[PDB]
Structure 1
Amino acid sequence: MDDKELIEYFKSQMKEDPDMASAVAAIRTLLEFLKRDKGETIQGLRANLTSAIETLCGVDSSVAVSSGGELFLRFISLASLEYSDYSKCKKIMIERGELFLRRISLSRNKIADLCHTFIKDGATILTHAYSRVVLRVLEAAVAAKKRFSVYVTESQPDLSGKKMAKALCHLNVPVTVVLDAAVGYIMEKADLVIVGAEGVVENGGIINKIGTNQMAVCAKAQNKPFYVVAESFKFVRLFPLNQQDVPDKFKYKAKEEHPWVDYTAPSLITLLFTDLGVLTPSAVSDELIKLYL
Structure 2
Amino acid sequence: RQQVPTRKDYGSKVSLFSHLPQYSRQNSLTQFMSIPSSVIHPAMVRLGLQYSQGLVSGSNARCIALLRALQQVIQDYTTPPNEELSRDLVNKLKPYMSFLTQCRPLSASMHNAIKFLNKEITSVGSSKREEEAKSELRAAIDRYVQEKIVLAAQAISRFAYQKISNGDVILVYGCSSLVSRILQEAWTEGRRFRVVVVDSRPWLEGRHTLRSLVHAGVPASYLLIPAASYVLPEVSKVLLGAHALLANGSVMSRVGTAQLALVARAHNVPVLVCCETYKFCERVQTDAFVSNELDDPDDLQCKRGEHVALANWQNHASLRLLNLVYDVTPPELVDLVITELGMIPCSSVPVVLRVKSSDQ
In the superposition, the TM-score normalised over structure 2's length comes to: 0.72
**Gap regions ≥5 residues in structure 1:** none
Q: Hey, what does 2:103 align to over in structure 1?
A: 59
Structure exhibiting the larger radius of gyration computed from Cα positions: 2
1:209 equivalent in alignment to 2:254: yes
1:137 equivalent in alignment to 2:177: no
Code of the residue aligned with 1:54 in structure 2: it is S
Code of the residue aligned with 1:260 in structure 2: it is V
Q: Hey, what does 1:195 align to over in structure 2?
A: 240
SS at match of 1:272: strand
Q: Hey, what does 2:317 align to over in structure 1?
A: none
Matches within 5 A, 1:116-135: 116-135=161-180
Aligned equivalent of 2:72, options 32, 38, 47? 32
Aligned equivalent of 2:147, options 103, 115, 118? 103
Q: Hey, what does 1:251 align to over in structure 2?
A: 293
CA distance in 1 between counterparts of 2:237 and 2:111 reads 32
CA distance in 2 between counterparts of 1:58 and 1:231 reads 26
What's the CA shift string for 1:68-88, capped at 9, x where partnerless?
21122224444x236375555
Code of the residue aligned with 1:34 in structure 2: it is I
Query: Structure 2 vs 1, CA of residues 50 and 148 (structure 1 numbering), >3 Å: closer, same or farther?
Result: same
Q: Hey, what does 2:338 align to over in structure 1?
A: 273
Query: Structure 2 vs 1, CA of residues 44 and 222 (structure 1 numbering), >3 Å: closer, same or farther?
Result: same
SS at match of 2:225: coil
CA distance in 2 between counterparts of 1:18 and 1:53 reads 17
Query: Structure 2 vs 1, CA of residues 17 and 49 (structure 1 numbering), >3 Å: closer, same or farther?
Result: closer
CA distance in 2 between counterparts of 1:232 and 1:111 reads 10
CA distance in 2 between counterparts of 1:143 and 1:263 reads 33
What's the CA shift string for 1:203-257, capped at 9, x where partnerless?
1111111111221111112322110111233222311122322x2xx32026722
* Percent identity between the two aligned chains: 22
SS at match of 1:252: coil
Q: Hey, what does 2:3 align to over in structure 1?
A: none
CA distance in 2 between counterparts of 1:212 and 1:195 reads 7
Asked if the contact 1:148–1:173 (Cα under 8 Å) also holds between the matched residues in 2, the reply is yes
Code of the residue aligned with 2:333 in structure 1: it is L
1:81 equivalent in alignment to 2:125: yes
**Gap regions ≥5 residues in structure 2:** 1-37, 297-319
Asked if the contact 1:61–1:253 (Cα under 8 Å) also holds between the matched residues in 2, the reply is no
Query: Structure 2 vs 1, CA of residues 101 and 188 (structure 1 numbering), >3 Å: closer, same or farther?
Result: closer
RMSD of aligned alpha carbons: 2.8
Query: Structure 2 vs 1, CA of residues 263 and 184 (structure 1 numbering), >3 Å: closer, same or farther?
Result: same
CA distance in 2 between counterparts of 1:129 and 1:16 reads 17
Asked if the contact 1:271–1:280 (Cα under 8 Å) also holds between the matched residues in 2, the reply is yes
CA distance in 2 between counterparts of 1:50 and 1:281 reads 33
